[PDB]
Design an enzyme around this catalytic site. Structure first.
Site, short mmCIF file in Angstrom:
data_model
loop_
_atom_site.label_atom_id
_atom_site.label_comp_id
_atom_site.label_asym_id
_atom_site.label_seq_id
_atom_site.Cartn_x
_atom_site.Cartn_y
_atom_site.Cartn_z
N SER A 42 -0.29 -25.34 -6.40
CA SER A 42 0.32 -26.65 -6.76
C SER A 42 0.81 -26.75 -8.21
O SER A 42 1.55 -27.70 -8.56
CB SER A 42 -0.58 -27.81 -6.46
OG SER A 42 -0.73 -27.94 -5.06
N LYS A 45 4.41 -27.53 -9.22
CA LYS A 45 4.95 -28.91 -9.20
C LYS A 45 5.34 -29.50 -10.57
O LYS A 45 6.22 -30.37 -10.65
CB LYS A 45 3.98 -29.81 -8.41
CG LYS A 45 3.93 -29.48 -6.93
CD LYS A 45 2.70 -30.02 -6.18
CE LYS A 45 2.65 -29.57 -4.74
NZ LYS A 45 1.41 -29.92 -3.95
N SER A 103 -0.47 -34.39 -5.73
CA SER A 103 -0.19 -33.06 -5.21
C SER A 103 0.42 -33.11 -3.80
O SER A 103 0.19 -32.22 -2.96
CB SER A 103 -1.43 -32.16 -5.28
OG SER A 103 -1.06 -30.81 -5.57
N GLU A 139 6.38 -25.38 0.53
CA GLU A 139 5.03 -25.69 1.05
C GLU A 139 5.02 -25.56 2.57
O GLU A 139 5.98 -26.02 3.23
CB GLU A 139 4.64 -27.15 0.71
CG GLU A 139 4.60 -27.38 -0.79
CD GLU A 139 3.42 -26.68 -1.43
OE1 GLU A 139 2.60 -26.10 -0.68
OE2 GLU A 139 3.23 -26.80 -2.69
C1 LIG Z 1 -1.88 -27.40 -4.21
O1 LIG Z 1 -2.54 -26.54 -4.78
C2 LIG Z 1 -2.35 -28.18 -3.00
N1 LIG Z 1 -2.70 -27.26 -1.93
C3 LIG Z 1 -1.81 -26.68 -1.14
O2 LIG Z 1 -0.59 -26.84 -1.29
C4 LIG Z 1 -2.42 -25.79 0.01
C5 LIG Z 1 -2.01 -26.35 1.39
O3 LIG Z 1 -1.65 -27.56 1.47
O4 LIG Z 1 -2.18 -25.56 2.36
C6 LIG Z 1 -3.85 -25.69 -0.04
C7 LIG Z 1 -4.66 -26.76 0.33
C8 LIG Z 1 -6.04 -26.70 0.25
C9 LIG Z 1 -6.65 -25.54 -0.19
O5 LIG Z 1 -8.02 -25.48 -0.26
C10 LIG Z 1 -5.87 -24.44 -0.55
C11 LIG Z 1 -4.49 -24.53 -0.49
O6 LIG Z 1 -1.30 -29.03 -2.71
C12 LIG Z 1 -1.49 -29.91 -1.61
C13 LIG Z 1 -3.61 -29.02 -3.28
N2 LIG Z 1 -3.64 -29.43 -4.65
C14 LIG Z 1 -4.82 -29.83 -5.17
C15 LIG Z 1 -4.79 -30.20 -6.52
O7 LIG Z 1 -5.81 -30.49 -7.17
O8 LIG Z 1 -3.73 -30.24 -7.12
C16 LIG Z 1 -5.98 -29.77 -4.35
C17 LIG Z 1 -7.30 -30.07 -4.73
C18 LIG Z 1 -5.85 -29.23 -3.06
O9 LIG Z 1 -4.79 -28.24 -3.08
#
Ligand SMILES: *C(=O)[C@](NC(=O)[C@H](C(=O)O)c1ccc(O)cc1)(OC)[C@@H]1N=C(C(=O)O)C(=C)CO1
Ligand code: NA
Length: 263
Positions: A42, A45, A103, A139
């Site tokens: 993320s 972004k 996010s 994404e």
């Molecule tokens: C960005 O990092 C975040 N995650 C993802 O894009 C991605 C997904 O949606 O599949 C993902 C989600 C959960 C995971 O454990 C690993 C990967 O964007 C939605 C999101 N961003 C966060 C943040 O703090 O910025 C989160 C805590 C969760 O991941």
């Protein structure tokens, strides 16, 4: 010494940690694996938002333009887009806020579409003199974080330098720069990461990310009580830790790095 302290965190936690602390003008002050590749997840972004704002600065985009979408555009993690979907759109401004502070992945995809996609983000990085960071996918596949894969990666130093340029340099207009700063200060997802390792009296803004294979990342700018301006990137792969422990690891890394700031 810094190398020893991060090296122990790495051993005790079975984790890989990359760090870069840079000055307002982008010079490296302290680092550990600072030139090694990590997945952005993320954290991409932040420069995505800056690209949108710089298009607004150029008169190529309007902040109140409606970005239309339907339910098929939604993602698993899209809390703002799920709220607005019945209206059929989010403005550019709402999308920028949501992508940064929550996010939101659907907002992020809307903005990728607006700017011309991953190649045009990559072109933006190059225009800023970042010869390393790149985006290839959108994404949610950009978060796969496969070992050795160069797609959708940065380095701690390259991201720190890029963010220092956007926040403290003059790529953006004073207006756009101030908007970006204030949105990042108001980030809702970073309270337990880098900011938790810094004095509460410092101004701090940041963008977090999580990835598959245990990825957990943060990049923050901060302004000390003496007015000195820094960027800190922390990129981690810690598949053997639980969620909250990955956050505490980042905050511990920030508290170490913080010792290399004068004051
Ligand atoms: C960005 O990092 C975040 N995650 C993802 O894009 C991605 C997904 O949606 O599949 C993902 C989600 C959960 C995971 O454990 C690993 C990967 O964007 C939605 C999101 N961003 C966060 C943040 O703090 O910025 C989160 C805590 C969760 O991941
Ligand atoms: Na703090």
């Amino acid at each position: 010494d810094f190398e020893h302290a991060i090296s122990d965190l790495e051993a005790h936690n079975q984790a890989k940690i990359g760090v870069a602390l840079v000055s307002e003008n982008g010079n490296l002050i302290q680092g550990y694996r600072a030139n090694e590749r990590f997945a952005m997840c993320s954290t991409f972004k932040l420069p995505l938002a800056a690209l949108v704002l710089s298009r607004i600065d150029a008169g190529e985009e309007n902040p109140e333009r409606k970005l239309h979408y339907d339910s098929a555009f939604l993602e698993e993690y899209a809390p703002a887009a799920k709220r607005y979907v019945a209206t059929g759109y989010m403005t550019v401004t709402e999308a920028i806020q949501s992508a940064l502070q929550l996010s939101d992945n659907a907002a992020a995809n809307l903005l990728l579409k607006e700017v011309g996609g991953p190649p045009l983000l990559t072109k933006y990085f190059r225009s800023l003199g970042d010869k390393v960071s790149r985006l290839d996918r959108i994404e949610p596949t950009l978060n796969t974080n496969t070992p050795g894969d160069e797609r959708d990666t940065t380095t701690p130093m390259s991201m720190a330098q890029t963010v220092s340029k956007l926040i403290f340099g003059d790529t953006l207009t004073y207006k756009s720069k101030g908007q970006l700063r204030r949105l990042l200060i108001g980030n809702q997802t970073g309270d337990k990461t880098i900011r938790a390792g810094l004095p509460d009296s410092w101004v701090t803004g940041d963008k977090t990310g999580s990835c598959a294979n245990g990825g957990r990342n943060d990049v923050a700018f901060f302004i000390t009580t003496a007015g000195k301006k820094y960027v800190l990137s922390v990129y981690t792969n810690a598949p053997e830790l639980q969620g909250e422990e990955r956050a505490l690891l980042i905050a511990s890394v920030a508290k170490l790095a913080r010792q290399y700031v004068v004051h």
